[PDB]
Design a protein around this nucleic acid. Structure first.
Ligand SMILES: Cc1cn([C@H]2C[C@H](O)[C@@H](COP(=O)(O)NP(=O)(O)OP(=O)(O)O)O2)c(=O)[nH]c1=O
Ligand SMILES: [Mn+2]
Ligand SMILES: [Mn+2]
Ligand code: NA
Ligand code: NA
Length: 326
DNA sequence: CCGACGTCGCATCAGC
DNA sequence: GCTGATGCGA
DNA sequence: GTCGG
């Protein structure tokens, strides 16, 4: 938290450009700058010092100078005073509501948490559940709770088929002391890049986790990805645990390492790694790493037998999951 | 200066 | 219904 | 908004 005030300012600017301006690249420009300043191990004394970092240009340098001299940013101060901005920003915090839906609700006058509650018939399913657990969905999850949830998921998955391998990724695998949610990568021998010898592979798992009342709600559900809600059991007389977000991703067994790399994160780490792969002439997704031909068309999947091999191709020294928290 | 900015899964909709 | 775009999300 | 070419 050496430069917490600065990275907060940039994060807020990033949120504004995303939710209000709907300018996704500005949003990522601020996010990158916030990220690169975050891992910077010096208390930044001036915007020019910060400009030396890759991802910090003139406009941000000027804003960091204003922030360091006053403790505030006049651009952010106005944005806060704007009703439309403050309204749209708030609505996007509800899962299922993006910038588009948030702005549309404001046109109708639906702009508060109470407006949403009286207008439930105007929300889709995802948004309704997002409103339902709006309170719970902003609480963090302590690692102690993540360990409990992990115990249940891995065992419930073992109870359906002993060949299911489940791996908790995301910030948990990065060794975070707390997580925003739980992320589960899933592999079964029947599902490979060649064939899907058994249908409902993800469905059976989800079905099981619902049966024991772990999974309580579903935001979206397909053949390879589940997006929903989970909750820890509470002993007698204790206040219930908050409902938590859970993502489950079924990825082909032979493509485990590309999947586990992607799911481990962080989102910005994946961004910078895949952006570096392009400069190196490769393309990385959750499945394979493919070379780029003379044209720029993805070639055939190069062989991968560890997470490190992916780093080897793009000429990166291996970085442990805890060193990827960007 | 200026094109390019990771990559993909699911829900929802317009168009046929 | 299918296909492709869009919205929102991982 | 930033940056490599
Ligand atoms: C949202 C997002 C997800 N991911 C794939 C990798 C992110 O690290 C990851 C897990 O998603 P998450 O739980 O939404 N993000 P996190 O696990 O790094 O942070 P947290 O635990 O929710 O706070 O999933 C991306 O590659 N880019 C993204 O923008
Ligand atoms: Mn997570
Ligand atoms: Mn997640
Ligand atoms: Na810079
Ligand atoms: Na949202």
């Amino acid at each position: 938290t050496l430069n917490g005030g600065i990275t907060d300012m940039l994060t807020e600017l990033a949120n504004f450009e995303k939710n209000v301006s709907q300018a996704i690249h500005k949003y990522n420009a601020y996010r990158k700058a916030a990220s690169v300043i975050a891992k910077y191990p010096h208390k930044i004394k001036s915007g020019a010092e910060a400009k030396k970092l890759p991802g910090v240009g003139t406009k941000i340098a000027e804003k960091i100078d204003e922030f360091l001299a006053t403790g505030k940013l006049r651009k952010l101060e106005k944005i806060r005073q704007d009703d439309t901005s403050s309204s749209i920003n708030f609505l996007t915090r509800v899962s299922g509501i993006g910038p588009s839906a948030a702005r549309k609700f404001v046109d109708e006058g639906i702009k508060t948490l109470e407006d949403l509650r009286k207008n439930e018939d105007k929300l889709n399913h995802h948004q309704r559940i997002g409103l339902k657990y709006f309170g719970d969905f902003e609480k963090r999850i302590p690692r102690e709770e993540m360990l409990q949830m992990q115990d249940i998921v891995l065992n419930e998955v073992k109870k359906v088929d002993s060949e299911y391998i489940a791996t908790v990724c995301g910030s948990f695998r990065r060794g975070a002391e707390s997580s925003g949610d739980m992320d589960v990568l899933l592999t079964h021998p029947s599902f490979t890049s060649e064939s899907t010898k058994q249908p409902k592979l993800l469905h059976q798992v989800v079905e099981q986790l619902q049966k024991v009342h772990f999974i309580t709600d579903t935001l979206s559900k397909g053949e390879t990805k589940f997006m929903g809600v989970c909750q820890l059991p509470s002993k007698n007389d204790e206040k219930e645990y908050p409902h938590r977000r859970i993502d489950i991703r079924l990825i082909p067994k032979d493509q485990y390492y590309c999947g586990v790399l992607y799911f481990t994160g962080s989102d910005i780490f994946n961004k910078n790694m895949r952006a570096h792969a392009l400069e190196k002439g490769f393309t990385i997704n959750e499945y394979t790493i493919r070379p780029l031909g003379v044209t720029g068309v993805a070639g055939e999947p190069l062989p991968v037998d560890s997470e490190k091999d992916i780093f080897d191709y793009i000429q990166w020294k291996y970085r442990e999951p805890k060193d990827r928290s960007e």
